[PDB]
């Protein structure tokens, strides 16, 4: 279980991930309000949050997202959407290690790290501007699905590049790195990683392939389309083969519906 306050926070930040799926939001003009036409980010719209910067998917990248400012919650928000070709990723994606220069012995998943390095330089300069314009604000990096994987690596990297207290909200994230990197990110703190029942996406890449998750795990045990109660989240303190989402078994495409239901229909805007 979790507290009502924690649950409120968890139900809230997922809505910025939900907005990340809307082309209207990641191609918005500077100063436009974030909006979810399918009605799945109401509390975001209620904050009045506006887009500072955004970046679109295109012929050269499957990653899109935005930097927005939330004056209600005093936060700069960096939101990532990855490729929405996720079923094909579960069924056929091959993984590859790479050395991201993050920590001693740390190796990251090449695809996710590559997606972050592609946007990193401009996002760092933009964040410097927006945080300077909002000095007392926290930085929250958020995403869902493959976007959550990019969010994780972005957070970890940014924490070594001037934002050590950056928060990470990674809904339905794959594993992104090996044991040393998972240990390094876990020790940075401020990590909120979510799984849902038997969602296959957080089960990949496999433990058997050398990858490990950031801890802890917030495992939502309630079904699809179900309101998440305070009693519907279990906190798992280590990434082991028999606990939480991974403990539900090896990944199966027949479980894929569980991937879309993380408090809301996160990808309704795709």
Q: Residue 64 in contact with residue 56, Cβ under 8 Å?
A: yes
Burial 136-155, CB ≥16 within 10 A → b, else e? ebbbbbbbbbbbbbbbbbbb
- Which residues carry out catalysis? 145, 199, 259
HEC letters along the chain: CCCHHHHHHHHHHHHHHHHHCCHHHHCCCCCCECCCCCCCCHHHHHHCCEEEEEECCCCCCCCEEEEEEECCCCEEEEEEECCCCHHHHHHHCCCCEECCCCCCCCCEEHHHHHHHHHHHHHHHHHHHHHHHHCCCCEEEEEEECHHHHHHHHHHHHHHCCCCCCCEEEEECCCCCEEHHHHHHHHHHCCEEEEEECCCCHHHCCCHHHCEECCCCEEEECCCCCCCCCHHHEEEECCCCCCCHHHHCCCCCHHHHHHHCEECEECCCCC
Query: What are the residues whose beta carbons fall under 8 Å from the beta carbon of 3, sequence distance 6 or more?
Result: 230
CA distances from 155 to 80, 113, 231 (A): 11, 12, 29
15 CB neighbour count, 10 Å cutoff: 25
Report the DSSP beta bridge partners of residue 195. 219
Question: Greatest CA span in the chain, whole angstroms?
Answer: 47
Distance CA 111, CA 97 (A): 9
Deposited experimental method: X-ray
Instruction: Locate the domains of the chain by residue range.
Output: 1-270
């Amino acid at each position: 279980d979790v507290s009502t306050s924690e649950l409120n926070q968890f139900d809230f930040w997922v809505q910025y991930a939900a907005a990340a799926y809307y082309a209207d939001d990641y191609t918005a003009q500077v100063g436009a309000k974030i909006s979810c036409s399918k009605g799945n980010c109401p509390q975001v719209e209620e904050a009045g949050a506006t887009v500072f910067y955004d970046f679109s998917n295109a012929t050269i990248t499957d990653t899109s997202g935005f930097i927005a400012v939330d004056h209600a919650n005093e936060a700069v928000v960096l939101s990532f959407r990855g490729s929405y070709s996720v079923r094909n990723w579960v069924s056929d994606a091959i993984f590859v290690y790479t050395n991201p220069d993050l920590c001693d012995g740390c190796l990251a998943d090449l695809g996710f790290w590559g997606s972050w390095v592609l946007v990193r330089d401009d996002i760092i300069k933009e964040l410097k501007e927006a945080v300077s314009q909002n000095p007392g604000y926290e930085l929250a990096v958020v995403g869902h699905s493959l976007g959550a994987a990019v969010a994780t690596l972005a957070v970890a990297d940014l924490r070594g590049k001037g934002y050590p207290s950056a928060k990470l909200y990674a809904y339905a994230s794959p594993r992104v790195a090996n044991v040393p990197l998972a240990k390094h990110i876990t020790a940075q703190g401020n990590n909120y990683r979510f799984t849902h029942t038997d969602d296959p996406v957080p089960k990949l890449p496999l433990l058997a392939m050398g990858y490990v998750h950031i801890s802890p795990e917030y495992w939502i045990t309630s079904p699809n389309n179900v309101t998440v109660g305070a009693s519907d989240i279990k906190v798992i303190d280590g990434d082991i083969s028999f606990a939480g989402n991974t403990g539900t078994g090896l990944p199966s495409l027949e479980d894929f519906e569980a991937h879309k239901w993380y408090f809301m229909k996160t990808d309704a805007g795709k």
